[PDB]
Design a protein around this ligand. Structure first.
Ligand SMILES: COc1cc(Nc2nn3c(NCC(C)(C)N)cc(C)nc3c2C(N)=O)cc(OC)c1
Length: 271
């Protein structure tokens, strides 16, 4: 729909940007208010840093993917400077939150709860025929009630035919990305499943970098030998074995996110 018919379009005047949360090459992220009272996150595009079409493509995708477990699109301003306005998540990224004094005190029970919430979000994405491709604790946000939501849909894509193939030139974080995606650029929900396994290590280590003490070339070489990540300190063996399922060699052997959700809820209630 054009901007004058789009239910997400809001006049810029409805927004007051209050506190800057991040700034990068491509713009800024602000905590702000909509119509005086409603707290929102505002992501602004830095003119010229990247295509406005490419910028807004993330919002169009979020229009299609609405769920309690996914960070919700609130509004857009489609005239420069372009804003994507989303649900504000009071406890920030999961990776940061697990290091704070509150984060540090969380029991294994609560961490397992949070993991299940994430798999729940990812099971919705899976059901809808999407993939995320950037799944990692930095892209999970935490609410004031300590619930978790999937965030950052910049790389997320609808599939028609099982697979999205990236470019030859395209580069992805080695530690989080499935081997078939790094090697062939072929991404499926099963690649996201692999990333979820890595995300689990971040949860249980309170945000530590995966594959302790290893460079990227060492990670690639270890995996090719059939090794997987060494058991993190203080990881329940059950959870470790669940990570290993995520890291199966053949994508089709990796579990569904609905299975992962189910298992993690069992782990959580048993604890
Ligand atoms: C300082 O970072 C914080 C960020 C948030 N919330 C948010 N931070 N954040 C982003 N920045 C992530 C950074 C780079 C900051 N790690 C990006 C997007 C698209 N949305 C959000 C929210 C969002 N949707 O709310 C809440 C905090 O409260 C502790 C602290």
């Amino acid at each position: 729909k054009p901007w004058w018919e789009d239910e997400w379009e809001v006049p810029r005047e409805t927004l007051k940007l209050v506190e800057r949360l991040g700034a990068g090459q491509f713009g800024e992220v602000w905590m702000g208010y909509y119509n005086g009272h409603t707290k929102v996150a505002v992501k602004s595009l830095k003119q010229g840093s990247m295509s406005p079409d490419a910028f807004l493509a993330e919002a169009n995708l979020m229009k299609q993917l609405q769920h309690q477990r996914l960070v919700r699109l609130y509004a857009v301003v489609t005239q420069e400077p372009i804003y994507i306005i989303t649900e504000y998540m009071e406890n920030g990224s999961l990776v940061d939150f697990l290091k704070t004094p509150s984060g540090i005190k969380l029991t294994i029970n609560k961490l397992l709860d949070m993991a299940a919430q994430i798999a729940e979000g990812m099971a919705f994405i899976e059901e809808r025929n999407y993939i995320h491709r950037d799944l990692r604790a930095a892209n999970i946000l935490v609410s004031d009630t300590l619930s978790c939501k999937i965030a950052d849909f910049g790389l997320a894509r609808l599939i028609e035919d099982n697979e999205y193939t990236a470019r030859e030139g395209a580069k992805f974080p080695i530690k989080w990305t499935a081997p078939e995606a790094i090697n062939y650029g072929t991404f499926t929900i099963k690649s996201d499943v692999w990333s979820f396994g890595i995300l689990l290590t971040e949860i249980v280590t309170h945000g530590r970098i995966p594959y302790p003490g290893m460079t990227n070339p060492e990670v690639i070489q270890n995996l090719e030998r059939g090794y997987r990540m060494v058991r993190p300190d203080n990881c329940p063996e059950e959870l470790y074995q669940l990570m290993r399922l995520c890291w199966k060699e053949r994508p089709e052997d990796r579990p569904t996110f609905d299975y992962l959700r189910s298992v993690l809820e069992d782990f959580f209630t048993a604890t």
